[PDB]
Amino acid sequence: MNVIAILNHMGVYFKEEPIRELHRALERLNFQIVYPNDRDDLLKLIENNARLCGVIFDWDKYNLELCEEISKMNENLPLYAFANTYSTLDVSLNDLRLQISFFEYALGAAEDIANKIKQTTDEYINTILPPLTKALFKYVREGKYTFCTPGHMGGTAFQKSPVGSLFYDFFGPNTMKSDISISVSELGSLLDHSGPHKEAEQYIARVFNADRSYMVTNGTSTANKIVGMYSAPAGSTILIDRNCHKSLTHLMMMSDVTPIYFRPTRNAYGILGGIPQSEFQHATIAKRVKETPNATWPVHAVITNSTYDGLLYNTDFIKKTLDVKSIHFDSAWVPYTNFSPIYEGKCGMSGGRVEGKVIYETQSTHKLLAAFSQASMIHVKGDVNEETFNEAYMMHTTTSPHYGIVASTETAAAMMKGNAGKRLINGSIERAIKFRKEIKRLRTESDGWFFDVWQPDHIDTTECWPLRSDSTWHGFKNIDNEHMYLDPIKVTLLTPGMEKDGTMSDFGIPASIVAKYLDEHGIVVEKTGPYNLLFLFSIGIDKTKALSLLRALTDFKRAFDLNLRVKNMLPSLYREDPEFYENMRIQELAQNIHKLIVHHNLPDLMYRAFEVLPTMVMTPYAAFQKELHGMTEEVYLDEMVGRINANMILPYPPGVPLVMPGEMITEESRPVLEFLQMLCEIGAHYPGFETDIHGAYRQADGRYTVKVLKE
Amino acid sequence: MNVIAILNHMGVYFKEEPIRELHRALERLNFQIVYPNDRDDLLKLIENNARLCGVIFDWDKYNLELCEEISKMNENLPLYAFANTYSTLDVSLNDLRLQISFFEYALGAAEDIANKIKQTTDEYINTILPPLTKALFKYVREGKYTFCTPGHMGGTAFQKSPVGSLFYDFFGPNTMKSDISISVSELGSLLDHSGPHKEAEQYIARVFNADRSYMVTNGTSTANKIVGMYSAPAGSTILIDRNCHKSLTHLMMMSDVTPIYFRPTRNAYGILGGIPQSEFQHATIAKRVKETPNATWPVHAVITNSTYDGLLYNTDFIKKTLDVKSIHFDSAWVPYTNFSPIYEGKCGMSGGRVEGKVIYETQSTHKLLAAFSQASMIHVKGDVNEETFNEAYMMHTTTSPHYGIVASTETAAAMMKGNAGKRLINGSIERAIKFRKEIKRLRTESDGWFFDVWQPDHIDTTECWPLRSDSTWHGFKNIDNEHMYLDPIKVTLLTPGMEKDGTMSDFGIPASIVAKYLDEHGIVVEKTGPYNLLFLFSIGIDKTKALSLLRALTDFKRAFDLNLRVKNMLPSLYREDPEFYENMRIQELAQNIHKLIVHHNLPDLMYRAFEVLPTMVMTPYAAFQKELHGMTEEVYLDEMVGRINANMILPYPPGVPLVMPGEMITEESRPVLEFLQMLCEIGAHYPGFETDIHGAYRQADGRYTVKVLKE
Amino acid sequence: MLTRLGAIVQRHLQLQQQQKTALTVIRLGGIFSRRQQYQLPVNVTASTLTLLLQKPLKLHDMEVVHISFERSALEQWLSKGGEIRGKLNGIGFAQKLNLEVDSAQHLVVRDVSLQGSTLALPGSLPGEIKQQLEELESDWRKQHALFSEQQKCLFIPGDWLGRIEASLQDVGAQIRQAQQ
Ligand SMILES: *Cc1c(COP(=O)(O)O)cnc(C)c1O
Numbered sequence A, B: 001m002n003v004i005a006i007l008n009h010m011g012v013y014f015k016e017e018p019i020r021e022l023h024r025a026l027e028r029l030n031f032q033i034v035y036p037n038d039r040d041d042l043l044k045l046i047e048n049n050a051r052l053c054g055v056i057f058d059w060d061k062y063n064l065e066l067c068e069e070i071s072k073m074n075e076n077l078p079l080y081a082f083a084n085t086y087s088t089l090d091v092s093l094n095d096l097r098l099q100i101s102f103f104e105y106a107l108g109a110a111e112d113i114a115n116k117i118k119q120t121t122d123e124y125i126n127t128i129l130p131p132l133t134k135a136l137f138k139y140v141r142e143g144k145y146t147f148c149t150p151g152h153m154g155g156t157a158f159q160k161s162p163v164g165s166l167f168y169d170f171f172g173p174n175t176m177k178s179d180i181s182i183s184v185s186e187l188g189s190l191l192d193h194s195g196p197h198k199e200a201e202q203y204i205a206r207v208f209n210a211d212r213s214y215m216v217t218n219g220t221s222t223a224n225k226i227v228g229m230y231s232a233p234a235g236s237t238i239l240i241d242r243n244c245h246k247s248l249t250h251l252m253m254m255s256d257v258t259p260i261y262f263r264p265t266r267n268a269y270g271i272l273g274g275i276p277q278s279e280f281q282h283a284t285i286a287k288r289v290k291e292t293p294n295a296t297w298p299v300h301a302v303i304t305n306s307t308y309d310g311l312l313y314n315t316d317f318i319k320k321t322l323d324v325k326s327i328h329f330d331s332a333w334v335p336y337t338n339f340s341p342i343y344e345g346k347c348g349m350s351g352g353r354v355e356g357k358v359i360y361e362t363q364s365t366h367k368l369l370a371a372f373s374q375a376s377m378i379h380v381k382g383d384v385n386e387e388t389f390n391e392a393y394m395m396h397t398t399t400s401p402h403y404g405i406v407a408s409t410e411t412a413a414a415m416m417k418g419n420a421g422k423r424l425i426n427g428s429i430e431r432a433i434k435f436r437k438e439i440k441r442l443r444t445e446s447d448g449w450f451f452d453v454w455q456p457d458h459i460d461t462t463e464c465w466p467l468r469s470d471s472t473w474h475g476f477k478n479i480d481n482e483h484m485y486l487d488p489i490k491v492t493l494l495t496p497g498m499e500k501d502g503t504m505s506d507f508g509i510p511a512s513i514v515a516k517y518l519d520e521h522g523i524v525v526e527k528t529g530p531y532n533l534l535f536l537f538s539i540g541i542d543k544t545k546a547l548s549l550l551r552a553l554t555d556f557k558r559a560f561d562l563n564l565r566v567k568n569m570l571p572s573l574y575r576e577d578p579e580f581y582e583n584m585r586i587q588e589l590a591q592n593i594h595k596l597i598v599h600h601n602l603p604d605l606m607y608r609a610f611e612v613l614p615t616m617v618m619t620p621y622a623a624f625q626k627e628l629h630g631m632t633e634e635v636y637l638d639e640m641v642g643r644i645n646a647n648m649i650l651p652y653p654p655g656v657p658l659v660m661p662g663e664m665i666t667e668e669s670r671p672v673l674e675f676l677q678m679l680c681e682i683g684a685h686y687p688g689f690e691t692d693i694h695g696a697y698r699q700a701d702g703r704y705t706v707k708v709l710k711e
Numbered sequence C: 001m002l003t004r005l006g007a008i009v010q011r012h013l014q015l016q017q018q019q020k021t022a023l024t025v026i027r028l029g030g031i032f033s034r035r036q037q038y039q040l041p042v043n044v045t046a047s048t049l050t051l052l053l054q055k056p057l058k059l060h061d062m063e064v065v066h067i068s069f070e071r072s073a074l075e076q077w078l079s080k081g082g083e084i085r086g087k088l089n090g091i092g093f094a095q096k097l098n099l100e101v102d103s104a105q106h107l108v109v110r111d112v113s114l115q116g117s118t119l120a121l122p123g124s125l126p127g128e129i130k131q132q133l134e135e136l137e138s139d140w141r142k143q144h145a146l147f148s149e150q151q152k153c154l155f156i157p158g159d160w161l162g163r164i165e166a167s168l169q170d171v172g173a174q175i176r177q178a179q180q
């Protein structure tokens, strides 16, 4: 932060001479001087250059063209406008947040002006930063307390060993001096929630529109376990969603509760829809309570909103129909449903305080924002616990939290506040819609097959596309209107290979080959499998990383139409088995795999398996108690009919749990076992595309085994 | 790491000219050149300067005076010795680990020599660093993958916001690029325990002498809870120590187990002794099983070795007498009992594998070493079931661990290998014994009172001082011989105020007044209270911090003998209450507090309130279940006899728990309640010396109220 | 009875490649350092079962044709590690052998000459299929015996006798087909 802009040349000498005198004075305090051209030149030095903090221009030249466009981006940006004798303000400059510093063209006084710019810049630093981050930067330059934790104390112990000096020179002196415990008084303590830490929780909840936002120092997986131990006593009932995460599985194994699983909608491409509106009515909550033995009134409900693919629900209908006093929204993938008008009434934080209910959201921090790892937040919309609830938070968090993660956690809430932060959300949507239009433009004009985006036929608007009932792009049979939405920054590339009715085609390329092709250039696919490709277009993906993805997609069509070899295209796959992948081309591999999907019938064995629910014998908490005693056996793949499993089957593809730990597979869930036996044959003929199931371990012959319980 | 040493001068020209040509070549690749004098000059450039990696000297001048002293300090240190025509090795140079690189005195080839030194230095970096840390440093300069977690992606999102640029420029470019999740293939995953993470666990266990070691990413408070969830099923019995930590209290409140508390020894000064050998017998443990309702055979034991003060035990007698298959040693304060001959057979790792038993240790990493916060280890010595113990490790650790802490956790284990690491433990012991001798030297020669070190009369030896039964310095009534040892680096300062028999004296200065004077200069007291102190002298405490502590102690005697004012000595205490601390001097405050200790009788009430254990009605797990339902209330301190408390009382002083959450104060534990009422009267007359008890809320009248359970 | 008859048909097709005779060792689930192994489930249930071998070896300076292992001792060596102890020819004490894991999931017995020997189990409509089928067939006669006594009720419609009897004969006609 040391860029000073000097716009417009008046041509005279009594105004340009103080500019040259100030040019030699600002460089003595480390400041970069730039000279833009016209009015449009200065506008490009703010959005693309965020390290600017000084604009010098003539007040009697552009008093209305510059004081309006700059205020729409950065409001607290200082403006070093030089006025004259006959200078005045304007009536249209009253409702604009600006910082104008008036000066003169006095010769010899350039030294006093340089001291005022440095002091004004320091005021901008001490304003946009939160009090928690301000206390961390000040403690390094002044706080030098001895005999404290940790033992390195800013890297002192590393300067006494040759191997330790290599680790200290990598980061920096300011990095090691910022890792302190709670042994400092002027920085407060996270476990006590006082001082700077008390105002930090009120600053995040106010910006993100909440009542009390916490700062979890152990990722999102820990935040979902602390909240689950609150509204679920030892012997209750929860309404957990079927499409749950691995962190939510361990929650049911540590609390003696009786969960009730839902049946979300799904199609044939593997993209799971959402929970229908019929599962939220009053005739449905108490419907499965009396049928399932040992179950009381549900006091907590976990809703995956949004899912792993990015499909927002309708919170305006759930907060009124679902009669649960503790509704949880797994918003671990949408930490931005507030800074845009196309997200009002779509999340739990949007709206007001529901009478007699509370909204629980565990939005991830180190996923689609800008902070260090092991960080999460807990949003509150209503009345919760804090005194006794703090005891449960300390059970998973050590007494010496890492302030480097806490300082970056609150930073994500400060980088989004104001118009300067809202341009990152709207900018990511505009870059996502532009990327969606480039696919349809390069599809009809091209000569041959091309990728397709799972989007409606009309994408001219800038909002969330609803999933209606008279459309064919979503393919969800019997879907509720005004319930399922679409995330514009979640572009889902549908590779050719299937029709629009749910059957199979004759010419197509699976998404598994394209997934490994993007890794050669440096692009990691988020989700892949059947005929879908998921990507993340958050604030981290700028215009460079967004346009580079389309260039890699056009190279796959060129290499496939010309019929190239595997060695001259995929060097990583060739090193796995050079003997088998010797005389094989790119067209021979794509056609042999496509015939195996039709022969083994993948869409039918997948749509019928994940739809039905296996018979749950006991609670997931009882399955963990049997493992601690040492009564876990295993059988073959064709011998697990009628046994109680102990693990959570997570087959890749897709990416959702299949059988929960503590369920029995009988005659009702026969297609469930058929999906596991199909993957054991399709992923054994060609190396590289082996079967990946978090539960079905690989042996040495081909058949997989699962962990069950003893009889 | 860029210091090159050129020792000695042959006086000729055919040997000094290649040195001058090499002087201009090494500076082009960023290297510092130093010219030491005699043999004693080079020895000072290694112990004090750790950033050295090049030693240039004549081989035909000092072939035995340099190859022996350098080998005793570093094994892999490159030696750029220049040999001649008639040069040979020595018979006494066969059992020494050295790296000698021979060269010649050829002109013009100075450029080729500079390339060999840079490549040799790179080999030294890739050898002393572990494969996990080396892969992290190489991934920054080469690995540039896109579409991965977290969202910052090496600090990309911070370069688009004005507030984000200030947070990115504080640390460094290499800091943000090193924070990666499990989205990297060539580095493996921590939860999967494969690849670089697999060899990292075997490397730490080999250095610290163990079979398997873990890397907890959530501090020591989390590692102690994972061990308790393994050898203690839902309905068992554990042998937890009375001197437990706040983290160990939550372990008893999350598992439905029946703990059995021991009866450690103690003196009058407040120094926590240890558990006698009679409690480890078979007839003693089995006697408390029948007396405690709902308790079976103990299958786990928790021993705090060492305590918070610094007194080791005797593991050679515990591992044979204590018949527990799961013995735990909370080594959260001794991460060095291995690399020294005066620490053999004192910890759980020293020795061999005990059949039918196993040792669990949770050594703290960011306490007395050099690493980031939220770091711990799990040392297991025996044959256990990793498939069960790892299940509890994944439930308390997120799926995306912070590799910045893991890279520093293994770094602490790499800083101990070789002679460069052995001098850190022995160096802190030599500085501790020297500091102990400076106290006794400045005590007799001084004219008046002086501080005393809790040490035997003979400290001439260099080992752990045993606590015998024919001594008067320890003051423990009936102590077991060859069972309690003294920690040399843990210097316990005793302020004059009590006698050698356990009574009081007329002239005395409490340790709380001295603790406030040390904080003015920046010295933070680790433990303080009645008439005792404690300081941490780990490997990070150099000779500067050791000599600065004695100077601050001598200044307290000068300010007290001359009778100065509080305002002209303690400016921090004066700002708390300038009206009351106006006409008060340093001698008036030191005498008024000493009379309150004798009047209220502190040593007698404290010694009798810790031996008699309160009656435990229910298990600590049942007390937490009644708190979530809303059946808790607060009562007065004078009205609580016969009620079950809900929190843990932790009065300061000392630092040990008083009443466990779930105990009842009846007629047997009468002095226990008298200890709480005594601190409320002595800590309410003079500002700054308020009563600090964790669990006692302060009201408006001065009577503390504790939270109990409803009847 | 349909949920039990369908499992017999699937089990009958699995035993076609097990009843020349090898022994495939399965890997037990979990996250452990050493690659642990697990025994066979319903295939073997005895405690002191015997195991055969192909190429004989000279162990303890004597020949052997069958080696018996203990079920209580095999589950501990294949999980916690250590050394296995097994007697020879069903007599003597449980001597120590040099048994390791094979790449094709087998039991290779090493001797003083570093020789391989794959172990196998002794072999016998399989016996397990016939045993599990007669228990299910006997349950059909017990349920049909109650229906062949209370059918004389006057308060029962006559049209329902054609559907209840047809449902019982459908299972009986299918359970008698697999035993052919
Ligand atoms: C990725 C994810 C997590 C894990 O996130 P961490 O912050 O790394 O613990 C938890 N829940 C959901 C729904 C996720 O997608």
Ligand SMILES: *Cc1c(COP(=O)(O)O)cnc(C)c1O
Residues within 6 Å of the ligand: A398, A399, A400, B218, B219, B220, B221, B222, B245, B247, B330, B332, B364, B365, B366, B374, B375, B376
């Ligand atoms: C300080 C301490 C802890 C807490 O250490 P962390 O690494 O911060 O979790 C736990 N146990 C004991 C005995 C301690 O002294």
